[PDB]
Design a protein around this ligand. Structure first.
Ligand code: BSU
Ligand code: BSU
Lengths: 346, 346
């Protein structure tokens, strides 16, 4: 089940499974921030049980995969290259690729640049946003420069969490003081029950400024950790044991690699300009969450899905769940994936 | 036995042991590059058995301890601060501190700056080199600037491995292509049997240029890995299981943190100028290895040991062993430590 791949110089660790005959359409699962192959624990057995060869990797910088320090190692095309390397290790011509959160842009771009290797693509939480990487209330497909739109048009004397993440200084310092607690905080805050709670504190007007006054919109000089909300008890879907696993992965891997993903957003935006316009042709699908910030911020990109993906197979919304979609609604997510993959030809 | 310390914002993981009454002089073991608390596996039980509270940590950037990205987190005083934090967690006023390789300058500097917290200090492989951090054939106590002496006076069109390590680009890339193999290579090359082998290839003249034409002296553009020597079989002291452990630690931690230690050598040299001259007063001891590059390069600093450490208790040389001293000669190392600590007052 545990595999160590390294087709072209980069070590990629993974957890695989499939029918005993080890035959069936290859399905690659790409996790987001700050997660791991473990975020797909509820999907792996279902996918393998339906007859698919499922491969859940640790992206570079995460878990047991190669940890690079230089910023250029975390640019979008490199991430996409790793996926290509995964298929070449299994000797697969085509593959179904599913990505959640940061894994999404990587899955989307993989489909964008390598349609000949993609039997279909599914993005979760973060909808296809072209050179933009992640669609926002103002820029669904990276119309304006990422960092620019952040600074101006997001807060007077405040700071966009992504720019903070990119600095890789204060952010890591705040995490290291108490990493287990930080994960718990972040996880709960953007989770369904966490978001519905914050809302329950009522006391509807312009989404563009809803991001502001939001948990991820901090005041220059403060700590993101300062806006976290902690549960009195561990949610039913995210148990103590799960938290110990993630904590274990990150106090060993650190957040340097993961955060570098963010550091390159602008760079990615630039690297993908030569693709702007061209459509994404493999069969595509998007799974969103009612209270997921990703789904929300990407509303406009979603509305214009069919415009850029001529073979879009639909937008699916999972009610009463937040950001950690495949973890917050594993069975519903499984049904959706299984339906998508089942109606397709490997 | 496994402990998670965090007295002041930095997570430090460790493996501890002691008599059941959990009482006795505190002994802190500091590992080097690229090692872990595991490098002291043969010492922990002996020290605990003799009645000492032994604590073997993972320095920052290693194993399960906090992984910082910024360069300033890996400067000498920060490393030393972590040690201080270790004693405060056990509430110990004084402690015996043993350091091998990179752990040595940290143990030495700890004694240098905090004599009031040090019952005694032991450096292994790397002898006390003042603001120099690591003594060299030319500069035993950091007489000339570290990087300067490297460039000029070390190779025409060649490059000093430490400067390469500091760049943190090519070095990591070469490692990631095959990390398990890299560790095996590095470990064997500078090991006793590896060094005696290279020498057996005879075919004595100026040590200053012996470093050159050496394995750690590479030609600009080449890979350090290019000069490695691999054993036909695993040495008796460094087994497959040990290698799997180290491999496991590093493909999770990466080398970014460890390498940053090197990146700050010059900076350290600068940070410790305000200490130049002042003597190191706690009871000190040095353990060297006949074929250890550390012991060899630090020959001059060794000859002048009593000059800077008025309470030096002696230089000890372990024959027929290379760089990995406490691993290559665990029992001999244990006897030496036990003798040193036994004749002292906690
Ligand atoms: O910001 C997040 N993701 C992201 C993915 C691709 C491009 C840019 C950003 N995730 C996130 C997840 C949980 C809490 C906060 C943010
Ligand atoms: O270079 C090494 N150590 C060191 C420690 C303190 C300051 C500067 C350098 N170790 C080393 C160990 C094995 C192989 C090669 C180098």
């Amino acid at each position: 089940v545990h595999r160590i791949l390294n087709c072209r110089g980069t070590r990629i660790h993974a957890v695989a499974d499939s029918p005993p005959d080890q035959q069936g359409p290859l399905v690659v699962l790409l996790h987001g921030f700050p997660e791991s192959w473990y975020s797909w624990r509820h999907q792996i057995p279902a996918l393998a049980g339906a007859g698919y060869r499922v491969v859940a990797i640790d992206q570079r910088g995460y878990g047991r995969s190669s940890k690079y320090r230089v910023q250029k190692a975390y640019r979008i095309k490199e991430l996409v290259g790793d996926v290509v390397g995964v298929l070449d290790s299994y000797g697969a011509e085509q593959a179904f690729v599913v990505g959640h959160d940061w894994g999404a842009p990587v899955a989307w771009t993989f489909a964008w640049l390598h349609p000949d290797r993609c039997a279909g693509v599914v993005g979760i939480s973060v909808p296809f946003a072209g050179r933009g990487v992640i669609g926002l209330p103002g820029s669904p497909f990276g119309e304006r420069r990422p960092s620019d739109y952040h600074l101006e048009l997001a807060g007077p004397g405040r700071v966009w969490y992504q720019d903070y993440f990119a600095v890789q200084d204060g952010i890591i310092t705040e995490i290291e003081e108490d990493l287990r607690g930080w994960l718990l905080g972040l996880t709960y805050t953007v989770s369904g029950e966490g978001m519905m709670a914050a809302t329950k504190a009522a006391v509807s007007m312009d989404p563009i400024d809803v991001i502001r006054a939001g948990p991820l919109c901090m005041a220059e000089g403060a700590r993101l950790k300062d806006a976290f909300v902690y549960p009195e008890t561990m949610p039913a879907w995210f148990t103590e044991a799960d938290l110990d696993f993630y904590t274990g992965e990150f106090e060993r891997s650190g957040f340097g690699g993961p955060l570098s993903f963010y550091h390159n957003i602008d760079n990615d935006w630039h690297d993908l300009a030569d693709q702007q316009g061209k459509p994404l042709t493999p069969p595509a699908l998007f799974i969103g969450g009612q209270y997921d910030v990703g789904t929300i911020w990407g509303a406009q990109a979603i509305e214009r899905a069919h415009e850029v993906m001529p073979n879009y197979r639909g937008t699916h919304m999972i009610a009463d769940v937040g950001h950690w979609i495949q973890q917050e609604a594993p069975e519903e997510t499984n049904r959706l994936l299984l339906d998508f993959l089942g109606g397709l030809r490997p």
